[PDB]
Amino acid sequence: FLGALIKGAIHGGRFIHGMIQNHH
C-alpha cells in the first residue's frame, strides 16, 4: 500500500514532464 514507486516519484516528478502533475 506504498503507492509511491520510490526513486522518489519516478525521479522527483520532472524527468517526464513536471510529473505531468506539475508540468510547468
What the block records as the C-alpha cell of 9 is 516519484
Technique used to solve these coordinates: NMR
Specify whether the CB–CB gap between 22 and 13 falls below 8 A: yes
What the block records as the C-alpha cell of 19 is 510529473
**What's the CA gap between 2 and 23, in Å, rounded?**
24
**What's the CA gap between 24 and 5, in Å, rounded?**
22
Alpha-carbon torsion 16, 12, 8, 4, what sign?
negative
